């Protein structure tokens, strides 16, 4: 039974059948000092205590957090639900279908492969900015989306019928996280007579955006989410919690976006990988839910697992504003208050006992952007011109473009729409109001509109060759931009709505005008994209922009109007007004107070009701998609999108022990901050690549390639796409190239081709890497890929959280250098042959010996961090383990 059953009591004696586990009846003073993020873990353990998956000791360990956070203690966590998008959602449903095949093969019941919690999937990663700056651009983009992705859509739609508990939010509805915040989020569950906190994992690294609403959620690989949907607890080392104390007031010109870029930079410096961050202090109460969500969104960019803002009265106000049901609201606040999970940030006596506290005085926040090449590279708006011009001549890097000083004032004329324009270094060519990060925030969306109106009335324009776009994460945005009268002015500046999906945020940015591309390449220009996103890594916004700056939506507009980031907005006007002459940014910038009025006036629950009323059913094209009635997927050999994966080939019920990796070759020698984009690119498929050759062989032209993310249900493409990022910096080649050296022959080959040779010869492979290996996107293809290339281990200085978990899930060993040790320090070339000794008895975090064919030996930490992770390793993977459990 549940040992804590006595804690269950009615919330309200008027409705005696609706109960909750009352953590206050624990009568334990440790509870009242817990970070509110830890209280969520505690509750989930108590309600789920069976003495099997979740044990009474587990509850004590979580309660004893203040002590046990230092004792490397694993705990279970069963979240309330799972959220997915289509890029990671396709391979997830392929995994499920493949697991059903495997379970049937072994004589099990394939209906056991079925989500036992709610799964919501939002289709947002497929639409691209094929067209912009026109009224019909949205329809034209929506049409191409469906035309390009029909098979994937029919497949997801079948998935939503063939597996229990799956709701799909169709194309043209907005973006996962914004839809989560405005519609999908429960805050408090009311299931089978028990209230409990909403919590989740999502197959997207920015799932942490939900934490702004006091919902404990974070990103995970699909394989981890798959296990969770099947009832497997998350296994984690009980985390330390950094208290981020906010104080002061932001200046009225400062935006949510300025604040998050400031905090991102701040927390990467601090180092919070493997930890929760939990916000508190007098400064939190002034932040709206949208503001808190902006900050929480960027959790993976600063490294943490969670960035938590507990539920307070501001959260409740957001729920009433977004039109949540009256009945539900009643028990959300009432439940949180009764259980001790309801916050008042204005009461220091209620502040938890965090591991340590770090501080931000919001008055120190200045208007800012981040770039040109990393989310943590904060640049004051006041210093944008200076910093870029410094970048022009600096050695090629995150803060260098390496342009000879003589050319810093280069410019190229070009003709666009029979008018001559001049492009130069720092010219803005992409200006996209994009990303759930910011479009969920009416302060910056209306800010952007009010700036647009001011500018238009002031007689300002955006040059017509500039690829401006507006890509909202829900239709509520457009609705209030129209009601408020600001949308026509956005339209005139070139910010018509182009789609309701990720779009430019994810690199789905579409073509630049031919004459603009010409000038850029012919002139050797550093052309600039400015976007309200959370990621700006070289090449991931557009192939032709060497500089990308994250900035608030109104700044996106400001740089569009100015047409360059090499501008001192204080010193230089934007243009000349036909009457009062000089028009400066200051004159057109809306104040916090002018924004708050329009927001208070135009963002009412009725709009949310209206937008979301028909969300699941309105898409006639979706509704039209025919699906088979099958429960077991009819794999089609003709498909280039959907393919039965080899993962479970010849799977046996019984386990055989792990053997050492013997005389492994190093497939790639990598450096620092290798992103999952480098490991498993998701955008354009290059004409000179293994994946292009495969698709060509199958009779497709480049225009039919689609993106890598779109091909994730086809392991044949995805293996070929592994380490195929054209900006991979393999230290074997000392240059950017998606290649490596096949050492036996000395030949330089595309990475997949080189791996084939090694695999044909029966040779094991490893990867050497530096710090922060696997940063960024949650994509488990950055683990499945290497697994299919024959990679048995990685040896790195440090790992990012989601990536490490995906490696473990695929049975690949994540090895870590000992402190003060790395490739240079050990004198490794990567051209040696590597023996990793696996002992008969394994322990989490154990050190193993690595032996080289040269005689050199050293030690590495084996980063299986919990007993459960070790069982995954012994099983050859997390889904292997789950098939075995379900087959018997």
Binding residues: 85, 204-206, 436, 502, 505, 535, 540, 698, 778-779
Please count the CA atoms within 13 angstroms of the CA of 863 that sit on its side-chain side. 25
Site map for ligand SF4, 97-136, x if CB under 6 A? Answer: ---------------------------x------------
Contact region with ligand SF4 (CB under 6 A), list: 17-25, 45-53, 175-183, 282-290: 175-183
Residue 205 or 722: which CB sits closer to ligand SF4?
A: 205
Residue 175 or 230: which CB sits closer to ligand SF4?
A: 175
Residue 566 or 678: which CB sits closer to ligand SF4?
A: 678
Contact region with ligand SF4 (CB under 6 A), list: 173-181, 242-250, 512-520, 795-803: 173-181
- Torsion sign, CA atoms 257, 259, 262, 264: negative
CB of 298 to ligand SF4, least distance (A): 9
CB of 501 to ligand SF4, least distance (A): 7
* DSSP 3-state of 165: coil
Question: How many angstroms separate the CA atoms of 280 and 356, rounded?
Answer: 12
Residue 83 or 287: which CB sits closer to ligand SF4?
A: 83
Site map for ligand SF4, 521-540, x if CB under 6 A? Answer: ------------xx------
Contacts (Cβ under 8 Å, ≥6 apart) of 462: 431, 468, 493, 494, 560, 561, 563
Q: Which of 505, 695, 828, 878 binds ligand SF4 (CB under 6 A)?
A: 505
CB of 556 to ligand SF4, least distance (A): 14
CB of 85 to ligand SF4, least distance (A): 6
CB of 834 to ligand SF4, least distance (A): 36
* DSSP 3-state of 411: strand
CB of 517 to ligand SF4, least distance (A): 24
Per DSSP, what are the bridge partners of residue 411?
424
- Torsion sign, CA atoms 444, 296, 776, 878: negative
Residue 222 or 239: which CB sits closer to ligand SF4?
A: 222
Question: How many angstroms separate the CA atoms of 568 and 521, rounded?
Answer: 27
Contact between 468 and ligand SF4 per CB under 6 A = no
Residue 141 or 232: which CB sits closer to ligand SF4?
A: 141
Task: Give the interface size with ligand SF4 as a residue count (CB under 6 A).
Answer: 14
CB of 178 to ligand SF4, least distance (A): 7
Please count the CA atoms within 13 angstroms of the CA of 409 that sit on its side-chain side. 1
What letter does residue 564 receive in the DSSP assignment? B
Residue with tokens 């017509």: 464
* Residue numbers preceding breaks in the chain (C to N > 2.5 A): none
Residue 529 or 876: which CB sits closer to ligand SF4?
A: 529
Residue 505 or 667: which CB sits closer to ligand SF4?
A: 505
Annotated binding residues for [4Fe-4S] cluster, as ranges? Answer: 436, 502, 505
* DSSP 3-state of 605: helix
Q: Which of 23, 34, 175, 424 binds ligand SF4 (CB under 6 A)?
A: 175
CB of 434 to ligand SF4, least distance (A): 7
Residue with tokens 């929506």: 142
Structure tokens at 764: 């094991």
Contacts (Cβ under 8 Å, ≥6 apart) of 756: none
CB of 272 to ligand SF4, least distance (A): 19
Contact between 502 and ligand SF4 per CB under 6 A = yes
CB of 498 to ligand SF4, least distance (A): 13
Site map for ligand SF4, 367-406, x if CB under 6 A? Answer: ----------------------------------------
Structure tokens at 543: 């192939």
CB of 644 to ligand SF4, least distance (A): 28
Show the DSSP H helices in 395-441 as ranges.
436-439
Q: Which of 100, 206, 742, 804 binds ligand SF4 (CB under 6 A)?
A: 206
Contact region with ligand SF4 (CB under 6 A), list: 97-105, 171-179, 285-293, 396-404: 171-179
Residue 176 or 307: which CB sits closer to ligand SF4?
A: 176
- Torsion sign, CA atoms 20, 229, 219, 356: positive
CB of 794 to ligand SF4, least distance (A): 25
DSSP secondary structure string for all residues of 350-363: G----SEEEEEEGG
Q: Which of 148, 177, 343, 784 binds ligand SF4 (CB under 6 A)?
A: 177
Contact between 441 and ligand SF4 per CB under 6 A = no
**Measured CA distances, 886 to 166, 366, 649 (Å):** 20, 55, 17
Structure tokens at 777: 């996107």
Contact region with ligand SF4 (CB under 6 A), list: 172-180, 392-400, 578-586, 609-617: 172-180
* C-alpha closest to that of 336 among 794, 23, 80, 642: 23
Contact between 204 and ligand SF4 per CB under 6 A = yes
Structure tokens at 749: 């080959």
CB of 503 to ligand SF4, least distance (A): 7
| H or E segment and range at residue 592 | helix 592-602
Contact region with ligand SF4 (CB under 6 A), list: 139-147, 159-167, 434-442, 614-622: 434-442
Q: Check whether the bond before 411 is cis (ω within 30° of 0).
A: no
Contact between 506 and ligand SF4 per CB under 6 A = yes
Contacts (Cβ under 8 Å, ≥6 apart) of 330: none
Contact region with ligand SF4 (CB under 6 A), list: 215-223, 432-440, 550-558, 717-725: 432-440
* DSSP 3-state of 427: strand
Calculate the dihedral angle through the C-alpha atoms of 779, 782, 785, 791, rounding to the nearest 10 degrees: -150
Q: Which of 90, 200, 392, 436 binds ligand SF4 (CB under 6 A)?
A: 436
Question: How many angstroms separate the CA atoms of 592 and 580, rounded?
Answer: 25
Contact between 779 and ligand SF4 per CB under 6 A = no
Question: How many angstroms separate the CA atoms of 715 and 110, rounded?
Answer: 22
**Measured CA distances, 220 to 310, 598, 761, 778, 800 (Å):** 21, 38, 34, 6, 12
Binders in 602-641 for ligand SF4, by CB under 6 A:
none
DSSP secondary structure string for all residues of 489-543: HHHHTT--B--SS-GGGGT---PPPHHHHHHHHHHT---EEEESSS---TTSS-T
Contact between 437 and ligand SF4 per CB under 6 A = yes
Question: How many angstroms separate the CA atoms of 144 and 128, rounded?
Answer: 8
Residue 502 or 674: which CB sits closer to ligand SF4?
A: 502
Provide the total of helices (H) and of strands (E) in the chain, helices listed first.
32, 36
Asked whether the beta carbons of 373 and 532 are under 8 A apart, the reply is no
Site map for ligand SF4, 32-61, x if CB under 6 A? Answer: ------------------------------
Q: Check whether the bond before 701 is cis (ω within 30° of 0).
A: no
Asked whether the beta carbons of 777 and 838 are under 8 A apart, the reply is no
Contact region with ligand SF4 (CB under 6 A), list: 140-148, 241-249, 260-268, 500-508: 500-508
Q: Which of 173, 264, 288, 435 binds ligand SF4 (CB under 6 A)?
A: 435
Contact between 208 and ligand SF4 per CB under 6 A = no
State the Cα angle at 538 between 211 and 504, rounded to 5°: 55
Contact region with ligand SF4 (CB under 6 A), list: 170-178, 238-246, 676-684, 870-878: 170-178
N-to-C CA span, the chain? 23
Q: Which of 166, 176, 307, 450 binds ligand SF4 (CB under 6 A)?
A: 176
Contact between 769 and ligand SF4 per CB under 6 A = no
For binding to ligand SF4 (CB under 6 A), which residues are involved?
124, 175-177, 204, 206, 435-437, 502, 505-506, 533-534
């Amino acid at each position: 039974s549940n040992p804590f059953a006595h804690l269950a009591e009615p919330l309200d004696p008027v409705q005696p059948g609706k109960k909750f586990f009352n953590l206050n009846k624990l009568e334990d003073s440790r509870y009242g000092r817990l970070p509110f993020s830890i209280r969520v873990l505690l509750e989930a353990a108590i309600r789920n205590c069976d003495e099997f998956l979740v044990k009474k000791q587990d509850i004590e360990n979580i309660l004893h957090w203040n002590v046990t956070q230092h004792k490397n203690i694993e705990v279970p966590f069963k979240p309330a639900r799972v959220i997915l998008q289509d890029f990671t959602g396709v391979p997830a449903v392929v995994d499920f279908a493949a697991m059903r095949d495997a379970v049937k093969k072994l004589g099990g019941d394939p209906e056991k492969i079925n989500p036992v919690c709610p799964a919501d999937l939002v289709i947002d990663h497929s639409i691209q900015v094929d067209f912009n700056r026109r009224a019909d651009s949205l329809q034209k983009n929506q049409d191409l989306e469906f035309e390009r992705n029909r098979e994937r859509f029919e497949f997801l739609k079948w998935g939503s019928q063939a597996f229990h508990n799956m709701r799909i939010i169709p194309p043209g509805s907005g973006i996962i996280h914004q839809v989560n915040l405005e519609y999908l989020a429960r805050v408090v569950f009311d299931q089978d007579g028990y209230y409990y906190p909403d919590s989740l994992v999502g197959t997207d690294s920015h799932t942490t955006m939900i934490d702004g609403l006091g919902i404990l959620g974070w990103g995970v690989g699909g394989i981890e989410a798959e296990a969770v949907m099947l009832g497997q607890p998350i296994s984690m080392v009980l985390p330390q919690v950094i208290g981020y104390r906010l104080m002061g007031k932001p200046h009225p010109l400062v935006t949510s976006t300025d604040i998050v870029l400031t905090i991102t930079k701040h927390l990467r410096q601090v180092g919070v990988v493997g930890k929760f961050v939990e916000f508190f202090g007098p400064g939190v109460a002034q932040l709206s839910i949208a503001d808190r969500a902006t900050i929480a969104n960027m959790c993976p960019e600063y490294g943490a697992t969670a960035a938590f803002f507990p539920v307070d009265e501001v959260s409740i106000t957001y729920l009433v504003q977004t039109g949540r049901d009256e009945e539900k609201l009643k028990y959300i606040k009432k439940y949180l208050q009764a259980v001790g999970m309801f916050r008042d940030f204005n009461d220091p006596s209620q502040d938890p006992d965090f591991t340590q506290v770090v501080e931000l005085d919001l008055k120190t926040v200045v208007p800012c952007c981040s770039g040109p090449k990393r989310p943590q590279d904060k640049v004051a708006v006041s210093d944008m011109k200076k910093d870029f011009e410094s970048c022009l001549g600096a050695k090629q890097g995150f803060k260098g473009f390496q342009v000879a000083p003589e050319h810093h004032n280069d410019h190229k004329t070009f003709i666009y729409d029979n008018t001559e324009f001049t492009l130069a270094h720092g010219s803005v060519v992409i200006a996209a109001i994009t990303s759930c990060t910011n479009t969920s925030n009416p302060s910056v969306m209306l800010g952007a509109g009010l700036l647009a109106k001011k500018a238009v009335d002031a007689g300002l324009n955006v040059m017509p060759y500039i690829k401006t776009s507006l890509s909202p994460g829900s239709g509520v945005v457009t609705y209030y931009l129209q009601e408020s009268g600001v949308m026509p002015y956005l339209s005139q500046l070139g910010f018509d709505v182009v789609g309701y999906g990720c779009m430019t945020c994810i690199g789905n940015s579409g073509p630049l005008p031919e004459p603009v591309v010409e000038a850029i390449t012919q002139g050797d220009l550093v052309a600039v994209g400015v976007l309200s996103g959370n990621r700006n890594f070289e090449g991931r916004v557009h192939p032709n922009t060497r500089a990308n700056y994250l900035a608030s939506p109104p700044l996106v507009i400001a740089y569009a109007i100015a047409g360059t980031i090499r501008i001192d907005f204080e010193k230089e006007p934007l243009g000349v007004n036909a009457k009062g002459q000089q028009v400066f940014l200051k004159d057109i910038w809306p104040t916090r107070d002018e924004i708050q009025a329009v927001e208070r006036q135009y963002v009412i629950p009725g709009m949310f009701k209206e937008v979301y009323q028909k969300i699941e059913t309105v898409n006639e094209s979706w509704n039209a998609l025919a699906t088979p009635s099958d429960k077991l997927f009819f794999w089609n050999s003709k498909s280039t999108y959907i393919k039965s994966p080899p993962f479970f080939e010849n799977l046996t019920l019984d386990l055989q022990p792990p053997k050492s990796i013997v005389d492994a070759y190093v497939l790639l020698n990598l450096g620092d901050s290798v992103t999952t984009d480098h490991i498993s690119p998701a955008g354009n498929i290059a004409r000179n690549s293994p994946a292009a050759r495969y698709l060509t062989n199958r009779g497709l032209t480049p225009r039919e390639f689609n993106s890598y993310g779109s091909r994730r249900g086809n392991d044949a493409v995805m293996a070929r796409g592994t380490f195929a990022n054209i900006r991979l910096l393999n230290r074997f080649l000392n240059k950017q190239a998606p290649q490596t050296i096949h050492l036996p022959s000395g030949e330089i080959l595309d990475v997949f081709d080189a791996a084939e040779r090694y695999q044909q010869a029966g040779l094991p492979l490893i990867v050497l890497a530096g710090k922060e290996y696997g940063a960024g996107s949650s994509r488990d293809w950055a683990a499945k890929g290497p697994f299919l290339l024959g990679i048995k281990a990685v040896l790195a200085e440090s790992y990012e959280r989601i990536h490490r978990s995906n490696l473990v899930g695929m049975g690949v060993i994540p090895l870590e250098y000992l402190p003060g040790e790395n490739a240079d320090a050990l004198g490794l070339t990567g051209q040696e042959r590597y023996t990793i000794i696996i002992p008969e008895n394994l322990k989490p975090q154990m050190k193993v010996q690595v032996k080289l064919d040269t005689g050199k030996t050293f030690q590495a930490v084996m980063r299986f961090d919990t007993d459960v992770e070790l069982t995954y390793f012994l099983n050859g993977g997390i889904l292997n383990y789950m098939i075995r459990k379900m087959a018997k």
